[PDB]
Amino acid sequence: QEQTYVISAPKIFRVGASENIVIQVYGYTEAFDATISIKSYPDKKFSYSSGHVHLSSENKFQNSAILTIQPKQLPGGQNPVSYVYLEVVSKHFSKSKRMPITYDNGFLFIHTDKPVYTPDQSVKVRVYSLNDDLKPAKRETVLTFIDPEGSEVDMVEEIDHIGIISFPDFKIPSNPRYGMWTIKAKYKEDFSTTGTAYFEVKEYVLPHFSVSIEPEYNFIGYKNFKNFEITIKARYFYNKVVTEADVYITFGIREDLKDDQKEMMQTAMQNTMLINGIAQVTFDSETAVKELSYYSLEDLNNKYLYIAVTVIESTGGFSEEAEIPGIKYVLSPYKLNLVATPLFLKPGIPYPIKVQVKDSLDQLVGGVPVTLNAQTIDVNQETSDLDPSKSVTRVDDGVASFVLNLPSGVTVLEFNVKTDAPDLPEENQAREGYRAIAYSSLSQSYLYIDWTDNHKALLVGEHLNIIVTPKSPYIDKITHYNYLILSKGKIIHFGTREKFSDASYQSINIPVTQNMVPSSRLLVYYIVTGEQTAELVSDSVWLNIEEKCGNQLQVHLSPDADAYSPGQTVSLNMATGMDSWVALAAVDSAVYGVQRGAKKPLERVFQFLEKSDLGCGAGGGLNNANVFHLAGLTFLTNANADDSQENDEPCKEILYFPESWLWEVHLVPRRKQLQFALPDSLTTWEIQGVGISNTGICVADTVKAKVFKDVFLEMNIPYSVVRGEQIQLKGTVYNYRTSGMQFCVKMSAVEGICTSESPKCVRQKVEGSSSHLVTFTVLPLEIGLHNINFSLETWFGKEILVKTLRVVPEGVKRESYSGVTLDPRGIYGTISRRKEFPYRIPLDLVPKTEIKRILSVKGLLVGEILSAVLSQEGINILTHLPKGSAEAELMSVVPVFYVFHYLETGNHWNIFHSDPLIEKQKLKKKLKEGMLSIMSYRNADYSYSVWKGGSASTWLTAFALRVLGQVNKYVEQNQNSICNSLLWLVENYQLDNGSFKENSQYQPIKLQGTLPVEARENSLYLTAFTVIGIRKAFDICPLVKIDTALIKADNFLLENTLPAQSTFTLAISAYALSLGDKTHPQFRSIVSALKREALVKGNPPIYRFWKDNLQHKDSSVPNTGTARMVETTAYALLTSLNLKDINYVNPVIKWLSEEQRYGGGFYSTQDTINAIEGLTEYSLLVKQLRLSMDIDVSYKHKGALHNYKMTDKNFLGRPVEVLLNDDLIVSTGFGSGLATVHVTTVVHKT
Amino acid sequence: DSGCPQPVPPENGFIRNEKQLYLVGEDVEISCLTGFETVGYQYFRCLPD
Ligand SMILES: *[C@@H]1O[C@H](CO)[C@@H](O[C@@H]2O[C@H](CO)[C@@H](O)[C@H](O)[C@H]2NC(C)=O)[C@H](O)[C@H]1NC(C)=O
């Protein structure tokens, strides 16, 4: 085993990616070629990609193939391809391995211009769209908005030309649901990546000042429980402290961070004054809780202190509410976890251990003292112990670092790490322990990466310098070792490192490249083939690389100041290392103030790129195969290793007053200047540039342009005012000059408002660096948006707040709903092609509101079309067994009608791919010759008989009638004979309770009849059979007494059947009634029984069928028992179909299509015909359910309003505003499939 | 998944589109037995809860 190979590949191929596959071979000395290929699995038939690589001494027998599985070459369709063959071929070896493939190429980042929207806003959204190589994907993206109901709302697809997809603005539907909307982005075509973002649709006003609640730390224990200092700070978004304000604190005992009875602590509700923008507070849990509640101690409350804070400006109309959702009362506050700690030993290398300490509601606690103690197990369990080292966690990292000098004898280390929490016992200072295992080399042929715990991030363009030592018995033979550098899934670099003469080996000196910047993984491996046996020896380490952007886009404004002034014309300069697209967004910092901790949209985007790393942990591994697997690789080798044993759980180790503007995308050819006027908001504009170029995404530095005016009015106009309510529009005049001023504030308003003061006015004065409370009382007369000009006539001219008051009508806004399921083919009965929604003005409408109406439609997709067919071996039925005597003729021809019907009901006469039964003309000839042969069996008085002169059989007559009714849809036949035979069967053989009682045929012809149950319900069987026949034929001769007879027989079935003795009878009678009143309560009871006689396999049923009397133990060959079982199953199936219950049907079609489950073939006629029938029907149903329904919606007195082109590609009806007073019509053609249209009426009732 | 179980229909109603589990936002359509007729909003919206 000297001649050996390793081919190293990403653990998973990404479709459309380029997978760099590297091959090394050992002990060859003649040059040879190998080809590496990706081939379809399992057939190896299609070569998706192939690479020819030359292995030779100047290659050093090392090379790689760039293989790409182009997405359109995979077959696609209903099944994705889960696997593919990686194959290598050479003069010396061939091997192929089943590789998994993933349809998950690239990244979708959804950038939403604000986290929060009022209604009536449009949410501007764009998606940054990157290939697996972090290049512009140029793939069109489907972008789906989910209302917190979870209902699909809208879908929009936009071509990606740029790597930036500027979607149309999504206008919030005219009655949204408040709360967390979801946006899902998916690539339209092959790749099935997803992006997701959230935005909150909420009634809000931008808070004026950022009230900040900053507890010393997020937990309360014995130290704090008596005394817990908590700091309030409030700053305006123009970042000057709220110089004075009234602070209101209120406290609650919250059992969980849930909607709760907060149990507010009136004992502790407190006031303080916000001295220069700060107020230190403390809560004493003792006096608060014992004075108010039973709880004596946090032993009783492993719970949360809720705190809410109201800051009122005290000299102004603004007030802001801040909260902490809860501070954890805890006996044991902390928990340990490891970070970047492999849990794998390198005997003789200092073993670094890093524990982070997290508190409850975890944050890094920073300064907790930690001690680590461990037991060292040497070979043969020779156990020993280490002294307990101590370290304090790093204050700004939470990490207590440890290093254990381990003897080279250690086989496993198990070590415990405990919080030396000074204020706790160990019984509350939680403690943890871990196993660390050596590499488990078989030969003891080890390789170690001498990585000096350099967790400090490496800098792009610096040379790496990693020492590696292959300590091996056979270093005489280990000429060289190989290395691979991994970044995301890709092997970005590979190479070889000679043994120097001294038996030192070359360092890995390669420079760290820009393709490494999120992270990299170094794997190092060699095969040594000492004695006659090869060992693959390998190691890997996690490499932490700086998040250096490739384009390094930076954005700054050209002027600079403490603050710009409202409307100041300003230049924005974008400067970049290369040509770049850049997307700009300015938002008011206030908008994040709407929330607590609202994360900037593209936070930590490198930490999302990191998620394409296929490895996990800081490196190392239990074994060579484990080292490769944890590195996110797999390999082909003959060196006595494979990683197919290495399957594992998913690995979780850790290592004008706009609100937004400048929403623009520009080509910045290395430099560009924008000019614009800063809007009138006196706020910090956080301006975010995001660069996109051939080197990926670079979210830049968030410029924070302070907009500031020395002296101004700001008005606390609420979001909305109730129409016709006297309300104080409170506000504040601010003077930040050092001199005081005398000011007059006045309100100028449109006539839709009437106002009190009507001032030149009182001309009040305000001190320097101070603000005066201003207020106006107003009454809004009429609904809508009304311009109010607040203005401040004062030294240095004027100020004028052009504002809009928003007025909503009185009472309560009520919403109530109507819809219809449009079933234009009768998929459920009555043809619901059209519906009309009258403009029903309610009796209690508030005097002048408008009734809002909103319409939407949902397509009801058919789902899983489980597809099953007769073989072309149905030529067996076309060319059936001899047309002999003893009704053998009938058995011959009857199935031909069914098979003709089946072929009619489908593509079979649109197309045969093979073995065609296409000569439908000859088939129709044989069909009508059949109908002749059966009509031969008709006796004189329109009975049928088994023989030309035999005893008239009602069973046979109903059977014939069934056949003839079924076929009359395809061959016209003299209905008078059908009328006569029907009225014969009714008048001669109807009797009450026991309808259609059979005239003695002297024998059951078991080849044609079933063998019923004989003792009882034989009559229920026969009534069911005859009712089926009549229901199949009465439609072509609807003589009234035949309907009366159907009433009689259906009533008798409904009454007699429910206590069914036999599943067979239950089934058949269920069917018969399904032909009749599908919706009679008795019918539904019988159905509900049948559905419980059903037998299944699988937790969700994969197969479902019915059996009775154990006629199933003998299923090895088709026989009367299996015949009966198939019969009763096909009746059940038919029934279900008539219920149109596809979800039920499907596993019954799956059972019926597996011949083996009922002994192979069919036995007798009945089973066979009923099975063919059922497959026919099921085909039919699936067609009828196929959604293709252009739905007209039109007003009654006016033009069309919308046209929903509903299709299974586009099943979702965007909500359409239906605000006009017309009666509203919705209609569709014959169309196809099933939809449901909903109109919601929203109205205010007194 | 916490998709809603099959609801109890109104008396004399039945579930048109019976399913063992309904995805969030599925309409389940109530319909009335032969003697009876749906007056109102026959559809229940399976909420994420
Ligand atoms: C509020 O003040 C603005 C001006 O700052 C008024 O808008 C002006 O209205 C006049 C008359 O319609 C126009 O000639 C000007 O062109 C408008 N200017 C602008 C910038 O729009 C507005 O009408 C005032 N509204 C109230 C209620 O007083």
Swiss-Prot record, chain A:
Changing R763H: Risk factor for poor response to eculizumab in PNH patients. GO terms for molecular function: chemokine activity; endopeptidase inhibitor activity; signaling receptor binding. C5 precursor is first processed by the removal of 4 basic residues, forming two chains, beta and alpha, linked by a disulfide bond. During activation of the complement systems, the alpha chain is cleaved into C5a and C5b by the C5 convertase: C5b stays linked to the beta chain, while C5a is released in the plasma. The alpha chain is cleaved by the serine protease complement C2b component of the C5 convertase to generate C5a and C5b following activation by the classical, lectin and GZMK complement systems. GO terms for biological process: cell surface receptor signaling pathway; chemotaxis; complement activation, alternative pathway; complement activation, classical pathway; G protein-coupled receptor signaling pathway; inflammatory response; killing of cells of another organism; negative regulation of macrophage chemotaxis. Disulfide bonds join C549-C698, C616-C651, C744-C761, C979-C1037. Residues 382-408 are annotated as: Involved in the tick complement inhibitor CirpT1. It is linked to Complement component 5 deficiency: A rare defect of the complement classical pathway associated with susceptibility to severe recurrent infections, predominantly by Neisseria gonorrhoeae or Neisseria meningitidis. This is Complement C5. The lineage of its organism: Eukaryota, Metazoa, Chordata, Craniata, Vertebrata. The gene is C5. The chain holds residues 19 to 1368 of 1676 of the full protein.
UniProtKB/Swiss-Prot annotation, chain B:
Residues 1-48 are annotated as: CCP 1. All cysteine residues are assumed to be cross-linked to one another. Individual modules containing an even number of conserved cysteine residues are supposed to have disulfide linkages only within the same module. It is found in: Secreted; Target cell membrane. Disulfide bonds join C4-C46. Residues 2-49 form the Sushi domain. Component of the membrane attack complex (MAC), composed of complement C5b, C6, C7, C8A, C8B, C8G and multiple copies of the pore-forming subunit C9. Belongs to the complement C6/C7/C8/C9 family. It is linked to Complement component 6 deficiency: A rare defect of the complement classical pathway associated with susceptibility to severe recurrent infections, predominantly by Neisseria gonorrhoeae or Neisseria meningitidis. Component of the membrane attack complex (MAC), a multiprotein complex activated by the complement cascade, which inserts into a target cell membrane and forms a pore, leading to target cell membrane rupture and cell lysis. The MAC is initiated by proteolytic cleavage of C5 into complement C5b in response to the classical, alternative, lectin and GZMK complement pathways. The complement pathways consist in a cascade of proteins that leads to phagocytosis and breakdown of pathogens and signaling that strengthens the adaptive immune system. This is Complement component C6. It comes from Homo sapiens. The lineage of its organism: Eukaryota, Metazoa, Chordata, Craniata, Vertebrata. The gene is C6. The chain holds residues 641 to 689 of 934 of the full protein.
